[PDB]
Amino acid sequence: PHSMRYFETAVSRPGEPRYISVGYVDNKEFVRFDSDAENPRYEPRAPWMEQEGPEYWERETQKAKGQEQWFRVSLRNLLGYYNQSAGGSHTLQQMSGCDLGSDWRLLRGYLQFAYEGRDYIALNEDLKTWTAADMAAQITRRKWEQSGAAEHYKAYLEGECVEWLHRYLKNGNATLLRTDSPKAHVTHHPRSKGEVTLRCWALGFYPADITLTWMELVETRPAGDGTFQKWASVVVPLQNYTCRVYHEGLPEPLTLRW
């Protein structure tokens, strides 16, 4: 199971909007564009991404410069719809990409927009129809049905998205396919009532997907070195509980106790 994603944000300044685009391959950041930079360019964010030549980066940079301008004009159109004025502080975001099955064929294509942090318009799983989140997005919806915008994104999602994700997955087998198993241990913290907090730690694992079972469960966090951390905890009296850790890099799922 594989995926490519591009996450785009344009934020308005009081009194030119900043545009940031971030590319992901299997949930790992691999390219990034920032308009605030001295010389705005798509930059490699993974070591295996330095394969590509100067023409690749230039082509991607220019496409980012087009998105930035697209995001400006859309921001102006949004102000007209929601009856706001120019110019305050606003946020426009977009998610796009394709999911691949193990057979390397298209599972699902994505295209969705958000204004002010909440849903605006999404392309449906069929890649033909649009679902609008509110009244203003309905104007966009009917405008995009008449001009047939759905077909253009359908072509990307079934074409370039899939075919380039294949290229990226080839170029980074030693890191995208590579696994790091969670080294797990359990800690003991006596509490009020005769109760103890048994806390199961999973540290230094890649990728981020994991399941902890025995109920406080913190959200998965980056270690900062490329690996991830997570823990789960239960309240126990005076220790026949077992923590179970399920992860791709584990031949057998780990079972541990205090």
């Binding site: 798509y42 991607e60 998105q67 697209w70 859309s74 966009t140 915008a149 370039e160």
Partner: peptide, 9 residues
């Protein structure tokens, strides 16, 4: 490979 949007919002 990034996307190029068509019609604006």
């Amino acid at each position: 490979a990034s996307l190029s949007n068509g019609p604006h919002l």
